Amino acid sequence: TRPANHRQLTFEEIAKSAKITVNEVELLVMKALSVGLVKGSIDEVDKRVHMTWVQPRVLDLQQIKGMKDRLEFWCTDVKSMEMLVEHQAHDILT
Amino acid sequence: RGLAVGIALVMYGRMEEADALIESLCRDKDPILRRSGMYTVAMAYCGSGNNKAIRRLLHVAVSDVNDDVRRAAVESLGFILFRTPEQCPSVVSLLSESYNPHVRYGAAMALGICCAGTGNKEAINLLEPMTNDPVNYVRQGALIASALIMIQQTEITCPKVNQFRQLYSKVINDKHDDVMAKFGAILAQGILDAGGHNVTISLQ
Amino acid sequence: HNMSVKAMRFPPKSYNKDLESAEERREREQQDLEFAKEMAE
Amino acid sequence: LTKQYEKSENDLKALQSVGQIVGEVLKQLTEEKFIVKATNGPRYVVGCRRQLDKSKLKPGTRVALDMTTLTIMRYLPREVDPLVYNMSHEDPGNV
Amino acid sequence: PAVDTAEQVYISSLALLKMLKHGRAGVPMEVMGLMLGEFVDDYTVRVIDVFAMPQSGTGVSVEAVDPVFQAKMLDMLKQTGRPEMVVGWYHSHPGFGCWLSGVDINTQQSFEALSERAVAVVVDPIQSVKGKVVIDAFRLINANMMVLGHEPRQTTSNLGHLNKPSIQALIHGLNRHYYSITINYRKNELEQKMLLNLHKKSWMEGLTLQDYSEHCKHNESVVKEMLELAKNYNKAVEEEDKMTPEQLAIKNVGKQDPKRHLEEHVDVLMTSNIVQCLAAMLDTVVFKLI
Amino acid sequence: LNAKVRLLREELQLLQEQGSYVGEVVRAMDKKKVLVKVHPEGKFVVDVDKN
Amino acid sequence: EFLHAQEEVKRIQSIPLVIGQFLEAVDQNTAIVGSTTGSNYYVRILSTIDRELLKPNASVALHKHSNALVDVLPPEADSSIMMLTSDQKPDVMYADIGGMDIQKQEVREAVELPLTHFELYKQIGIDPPRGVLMYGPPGCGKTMLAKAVAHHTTAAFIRVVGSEFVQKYLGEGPRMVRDVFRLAKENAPAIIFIDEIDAIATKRFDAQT
Amino acid sequence: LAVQKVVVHPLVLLSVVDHFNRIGKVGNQKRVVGVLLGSWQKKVLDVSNSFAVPFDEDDKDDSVWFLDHDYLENMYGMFKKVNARERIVGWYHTGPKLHKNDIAINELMKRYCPNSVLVIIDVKPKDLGLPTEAYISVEEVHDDGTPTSKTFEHVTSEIGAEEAEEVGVEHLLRDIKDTTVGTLSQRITNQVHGLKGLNSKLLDIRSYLEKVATGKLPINHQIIYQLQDVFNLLPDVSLQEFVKAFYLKTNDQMVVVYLASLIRSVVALHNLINNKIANRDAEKKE
Amino acid sequence: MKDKIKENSEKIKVNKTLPYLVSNVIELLDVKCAVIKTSTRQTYFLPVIGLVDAEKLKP
Amino acid sequence: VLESTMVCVDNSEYMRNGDFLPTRLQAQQDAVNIVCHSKTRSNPENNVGLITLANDCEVLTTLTPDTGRILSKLHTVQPKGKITFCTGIRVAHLALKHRQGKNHKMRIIAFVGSPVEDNEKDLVKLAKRLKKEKVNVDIINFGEEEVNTEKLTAFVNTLNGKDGTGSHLVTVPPGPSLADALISSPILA
Ligand SMILES: Nc1ncnc2c1ncn2[C@@H]1O[C@H](COP(=O)(O)OP(=O)(O)OP(=O)(O)O)[C@@H](O)[C@H]1O
Ligand SMILES: [Mg+2]
Ligand SMILES: [Zn+2]
């Protein structure tokens, strides 16, 4: 659910969401890390879990539309930078 | 090859009216049609000195995948600059020493066409080293051009007339010289004394 | 670098004279004609 | 005789064959270039046949090269000197 | 009806590549094959395609044409849209130039007996370099006509005298037993664009960044090299101050030039570092999380 | 640049011209003759170039 | 067109090429080279030949017809004599040799120590000996000490016998001598061992034989 | 897989183009099919030759199609006589994209070569991509419980040439190819082409997602799985650690660029010195 | 086939014309094949021996 | 006559029946052996080839002036699958369109021994398409002629049109051997 910029889950968040005690949260992450469901690391000093990868899941049509909008923004960025490089280096472009 | 000259002749002396044709012929993938475009540039700008056509001819001469097209592009400069014969030994002088033997032949032929009958000393000075070119047809073209430039010319009018008169005889009487150089020398002898010493060449 | 390169001047030497001379190039054509006329026979 | 015709045709096919210069591989320069020394002659930078192994052409290997292009035609075992062959094949006398 | 010296042999791109590959594969055999095409007119001999004939056995020479193989290949190629007659034969000359030997003359006599305008093409896959392939086309000069005092072919243009014959060919009977036909190439836009894809790098490696550990190690190594190169460059300047003009090049023989190596290292490092920086900057915009 | 290109193209033909033997001069003689010893090939009485 | 001419001039390097020895650079574009055919020629140098590689006693590739210098071969290439491989290393150890401590010390101080401690020799002021002549009555451990040196060296070892240099092909003897020395130089540190040096180092020479 | 890379020689491209043109001279065709011959080097295919085979198909039905396999065998023998080291490694066709009956044709070809490779060679001069697209038949074991089927797994395709083939190609590309451009310009043009190719690929993905959203195509549930990974792989260039590392690396490369430019400027000044000295000497002696 | 045999012999006679180069057979290999040394101090490998039975040859 | 033929043999399940002695598969094997021999002696330049009519059509052998290979292919032909007459005829027509010699004439031998599970419209349109290309398809209506006698009737009538006996519908009732009825049929005449 969380965007890639905010995939740092506090121990309290996992404990509350999973209906488990805080001291067990780490062990839960261990299983999810061992099976391969998720990827990341655990910072037990700050009681946080840095999650970097998720098992891909079945998406709804609306989620696919949002993904296509993300692709629209990505295509706009790629095209803009391609035109920038073509314009700036036009004289030396082969 | 016949249609290349024919299409050019269809648009003789048409100034810019041939432009729509010229850009069509110069952009064609067929090398012979590009040569036809060069000839059409020559015919549609006969002696007008139009530097647009000269620019196009020079661009094709220095950048073209076919040697025949380059040679015709350099050749076509004479038909454009004959009205100002002094200009040809300047625009073409550097082309006369290029790596491409076809471009050198075109340079010689441009000197011949533009400075025909004028007896231009600068053009003859350019052609004189070209008669010793390593390539045979370059020598032949230089000899024919030298004949065209100083046809009818006497010793007082052109100091180099006797030198080339003896050069043609030496080339013809040289058993070890290439057959095409001798062909050019014989054509040069025919041109230099054409019409029983009573005729000239003048496109104007 | 660009300023220094643009400041390099080549004197107007008689170019294409360091190439093959006409008489010496003809020497090779005659000697090679003799080569072809004698070796093959 | 059919066998006589076979032998005559074999001689005819053999007549078109040309001997190959025997040299020795000195060093493989590239995948298609070798330095080989003729048995009694100069050293040459030659090529090799594509169908040849090129792994049996270790330095010091005796090779047979084309007469014209000097391309390595074949690799041969170490030569036995005829004098050495006569030394080995000398009858003692059943003593 | 004397043949004209302006006759030209038009070899297609596919044909040229086929003969070059077959000749290089068969080095040093004089491997041969047949050239399918069409006699367009008395001045053109188009070579649409070629197919290689298998070698009977060992021997660096042209073998006899196998009629069974030729007939089978022609009949099967006619089944897939190649109904082009044999306009001659090609064979390879691995490194000794393009010409015809006595065996080649005897072989070409067969084709000339079949088709009077057949062409014997010789390609040198060994002496061919990028941008310039050593190739030639030949047709035999009949001894009866030339001996009596007749030129083998009529010269109605300059087209037949543009290529100066090589001395190797002249020694081997050129212009005596056979004559050379000017070879021109037919290249279309489609085939040129198709060939342009050779060595065309994939789009992925255009944005691919070099390993930064190896890039830094290379930068450090080359800079350490330029250290010694400049240390020697100072000495080179002082030596060339007091050095006679006859030694400007003779004394440079066998001794490395610090200036040239310095230029090479500078060019290499400029290119590598500028490319890496530009690629990283492009990737920081293209692949972004926001 | 054109002179460089032309010299490069002529160099291919020049490099096919046969190399020159290296000999040792024994003595000069009359009529511009020199007695030389080619390295493997004994002695010769050779002419002298006009240059 | 300059790039095209540079590309097309490389057909002069097409194989087969004869192998010569760069003797002298007469001027920028011409040089005297000693072909392996046995004749010295004054030929031209290809303009695209790296003149930094035209060192003395360098093997070059010459055009088969015109003898023109068209390539420079790598220095380690063109050597009829090969270095000792790992399998060719003799099994003789220093411990196998008994009672030659003086000879072992002299050989080590003159051969194996300068190879690893040349900077120390320079710092002290000693001039390391270029060569070592081991002499004595037959069967006194000379060749075996050479074997032990070859077995216990980190440098290249080039074992050769003096009688190998004398060959029927005139010029091949000196050619392979300079090949041995060039191979050793290109693989420095290296040790050249010439057993039975009397075969090419006698003091009497008959000029008519 | 059994195939890591497929190298298609320019001779194969020219043969395919010629086959397509000579068949299309009839004026009624869609694609042509032939057999690919090559050698095997480690796990890298070396497609080096090809030959046309008779082939036809129905425009409407995909199950109706004829391929002359006897012709295939006979020309395989004829080519093997010429070159024994070139064996059947797959087939080709000039259809711009795959066909539903391509799996059946690959099954037919698999008898002659068990790991057959299909190289779709687009005759049309595509501006960005390579004309060749290589595929190999694999048994796709789905995890949805659907029965295992045969699909075409893509294979990285490259155009490589033999020495003589490269010589011939350069002779044919002598005029068109411009080699005067420096290496740096070539790399920058490579970067531009990479940007264009990435934009094209992203646009293809966007078009597929657009078709899926409007229901023109069903949700694959496997392309979506890959796309989630693709979007997860997008790095965060706004991180403090990454920004500091990028700045440090850029400065490390810029100091090297500065040293190279300084040395270049000094060498250029030396060249100017030599030029001026030579000019002064030439004018002094004359 | 008699005429073909006679023409083959005639071709052999053309190729068997004098002079011959005197050589010494050095070696006999199998891959039937010979290695000879001519009096010109040249060593050649012959993939086929020629007009002499390989059994009648010794080094 | 200088014509090329391609036999549409049937290897469906119903060829396992013993209606034709000894088995319908062996019976059609003998019939194919007879018809290919007849086409071979009719003209030495004639071309023959084998196309199977299984669940999915498979061209066993393309046109060739050889006979023994056809029976060699038929020997390994096992009875499997259901007849697919619609696609088989078009596959055969595609094969004839690529014969070695285009001067040969169209001809297909059809061995129908199983019901045709198609609408009459598809059959008549196929017959019209073949007639446009001057394709003659000779059909042997053995096996289940009690149900196929109408669809094949329309096929042959539309193929032959109103004039010319280009194709025939020889129907062989079950008996000792359908090949013994082939030599009297117009197929081999
Ligand atoms: N110090 C030693 N300890 C043991 N064995 C020795 C010693 N010196 C010589 N030998 C014996 O010498 C034998 C071989 O002699 P070696 O080749 O070393 O002599 P050399 O000086 O090279 O002779 P030559 O002058 O005849 O060539 C070996 O079998 C070895 O056992
Ligand atoms: Mg000893
Ligand atoms: Zn030949």
Residue numbers in the entry:
A (entry chain a): 283 to 376
B (entry chain U): 546 to 749
C (entry chain V): 487 to 527
D (entry chain E): 36 to 130
E (entry chain c): 23 to 312
F (entry chain C): 52 to 102
G (entry chain D): 71 to 279
H (entry chain Z): 4 to 289
Authors' account:
The ubiquitin-like modifier FAT10 targets hundreds of proteins in the mammalian immune system to the 26S proteasome for degradation. This degradation pathway requires the cofactor NUB1, yet the underlying mechanisms remain unknown. Here, we determined a previously unknown mechanism for substrate delivery to the hs26S proteasome, in which NUB1 functions as an ATP-independent chaperone to trap FAT10 in a partially unfolded state, recruits it to the 19S regulatory particle through Rpn1 binding and presents the FAT10 unstructured N terminus for engagement by the ATPase motor. To determine the structural details of NUB1-mediated FAT10 delivery, we solved the cryo-EM structures of the ATP-hydrolyzing hs26S proteasome either 30 s or 60 s after incubation with the preformed NUB1–FAT10–Eos complex.
Consistent with active degradation, we observed the proteasome in processing states, where FAT10–Eos was engaged by the ATPase motor and partially threaded through the central channel, and in the nonprocessing, engagement-competent state with the NUB1–FAT10–Eos complex bound to the proteasome surface. Nonprocessing and processing conformations were easily distinguished on the basis of the major conformational transitions that occur upon substrate engagement and lead to a coaxial alignment of the N-ring, AAA+ ATPase ring and the 20S core particle. In the nonprocessing state, the NUB1–FAT10–Eos complex showed only weak, unresolvable density that likely originates from an intrinsic flexibility within the NUB1 complex itself and from its binding to Rpn1, which is the most mobile subunit of the 19S regulatory particle. 3D classification focused on Rpn1 yielded ten structures with resolutions for the ATPase motor ranging from 2.5 to 3 Å and Rpn1 adopting variable positions. We chose one representative high-resolution model (~2.5 Å), which reveals the ATPase hexamer with five ATPs and one ADP, in Rpt6. However, despite extensive 3D classifications, variability analyses and refinements of the 19S regulatory particle, we were unable to resolve the NUB1 core, UBA1–UBA3 and the bound FAT10. We assume that these domains get splayed out when NUB1 binds to the proteasome or during FAT10 release for engagement, and high mobility of the NUB1 core may be essential for the FAT10 UBL1 domain to sample different positions during its insertion into the ATPase channel. The high mobility is likely important for allowing the unstructured N-terminal UBL1 domain of FAT10 to enter the central channel of the ATPase motor. Ubiquitinated substrates are bound to the proteasome with similarly high flexibility before their engagement by the ATPase motor, which has so far prevented their visualization by cryo-EM.
